[PDB]
Structure formats: C-alpha cells, structure tokens
Amino acid sequence: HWRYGGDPPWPRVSPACAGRFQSPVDIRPQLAAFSPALRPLELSGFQLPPLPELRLRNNGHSVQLTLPPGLEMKLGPGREYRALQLHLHWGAAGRPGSEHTVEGHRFPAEIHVVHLSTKYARVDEALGRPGGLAVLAAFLEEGPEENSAYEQLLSRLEEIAEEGSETQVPGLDISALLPSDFSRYFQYEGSLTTPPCAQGVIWTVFNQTVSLSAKQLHTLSDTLWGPGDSRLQLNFRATQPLNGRVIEASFPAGV
Ligand SMILES: [Zn+2]
C-alpha cells in the first residue's frame, strides 16, 4: 500500500506517482544550466532556543522533526517559504541511501527540509501547484569527527525505535544540520518523493555535503524499525527520468 522496496510499486495505488516530472533525479553537473540569477540562499529564524521542544517521530518511513513557526527561507524574489519539517533518507550497513545522485554516485544519506510557500496558509492548498512547496536537500557523508548538531537528534533515535513512536527534543540550530556553503546548489522542479507524489515542488540540492562520523551514520541507519517488523533501512526512492527538464546550477561547474 506504501513501502520502499517491493509492492505496490506506487502508481497502482497512487496514480500521480507515474507523472512525468518526478523526484529524485540524477544530477549531472557538467550538463546543468549555469544560472547567475540563482543567488545565495537566505534563511532566518533557524537558530532555535532550547524551549519550546520540537516533536520527533518515527513514522515508519523516516524520522521526522516538526519545525516551529517562524523559520523563513528565500530562494529569490517572489520565492519565499516557511519551514514545516525535516526528515532523512538513508541506506544500511555498507550501502548508501541518498535519494538524489550525482553522476550516478549515491551518498550515504540525505536530509530534506520541507517548506510551504508564503502564498499559501496550509500544505493542502499548495500540493500540486507550481512552487507551492520547496525542499532543501543536502547529502550526508562520512567524516572523521562526530557532528555535534546531528548528535542532538541521533541520540534520541533509540527512544523512538518502534514504528509510530514519538518523543520531544530541545530546540537546536536547524541551520547547523545543513552545509555552510549557501552559494553553490542545483535547482529543478519535481515532486514529493513519497505518495501522493504531488508535482510542482521546487528542489534545491546543496553542492557541499555535511559530514557525520561513521558511528553516527550507523546510528541513523540501524536504529529504527518500520512497518510490519522490518528494519527502517534503504528508505529512498529510485531516481526518475528528467523528461526534458533542465537542472539549473548556481555556480560554474569546475571541471
Ligand atoms: Zn524526503
């Protein structure tokens, strides 16, 4: 009815998942259109105080952190957004699980911060409308040191190991979960990557990654359980054909 790696393949139950402009996609940087209109991203309100706490929950498909009101993200003139939630996609032991790929390369994991256009008061109004939702996406890679910002979330996974369980976590700097380079990114129009696969979503994928320790990546991929009694692993959708869409780059590809 809705699960990674099997049946139903999604269009049988959610026809919009067979649309022509779906996400995620494979990014080929030498083929992206360099677009100097794409200026550095602007975030405000992402540095949260310790109280009030946020909600962290295992929904069977990911771990999702609900963000409080007041987080603003600007992609450019006329493209202002309010953050709603973030969640992650990952693989398993020795197997990467990012959703986007770069030249076919899959990264260990990926963070998605989902936002609602300021044109709309409610998510339901914005579904399927061009630009109504925007997602910021960054790849997570292995580095040598523990990532202190991620540890605030990863240390709480054990208590929400069971599908459907929830907890509360202190406010933290949400921007410290994202790359520091706000100037280099790719952007394209796609869809939600889970059913109902609604189109019109503006995807922004940072070029720079974030680094977590090997232990932290194991904690992320190995702690949670999903539907039935499977481990919550490999929770990524396969990449989708561009079907003529152009991916834009905010920076000149190096090579
Ligand atoms: Zn996602």
Author numbering: 140 to 394
Which statements did the authors publish about this structure?
One of the isoforms, CA IX, has limited expression in healthy tissues but is upregulated in aggressive tumours, with its expression being controlled by hypoxia. CA IX is a multidomain membrane-bound protein, with its catalytic CA domain facing extracellularly. CA IXSV contains only the catalytic domain of CA IX, with the intracellular, transmembrane and PG domains removed. In addition to truncating the full-length protein, six surface mutations (C174S, L180S, M360S, A210K, A258K and F259Y) were also introduced.
In preparation for future neutron protein crystallo­graphic studies of experimental inhibitors binding to CA IX, we expressed unlabelled CA IX (H/H CA IXSV) and performed H/D exchange (H/D CA IXSV) on preformed crystals. The other H/D and D/D crystals were both in the ‘small’ P21 unit cell, the same as the first one we determined from ESRF data. The small P21 monoclinic unit cell contained two CA IXSV chains (one per asymmetric unit) with a volume of 123 080 Å3. In addition, there is only one CA IXSV per asymmetric unit, which is useful when using neutrons for protein crystallography. The overall active-site arrangement of solvent and amino-acid residues appears to be largely unaffected, with an r.m.s.d. variation for all atoms when superimposing all four structures onto each other of less than 1 Å. We conducted a careful OMIT map analysis of the structures and found that in all four structures there are one of two ions bound to the zinc ion that come from the crystallization conditions: either acetate or formate. Furthermore, comparing specific residues that compose the active site shows that the overall architecture is maintained between H/H, H/D and D/D CA IXSV.
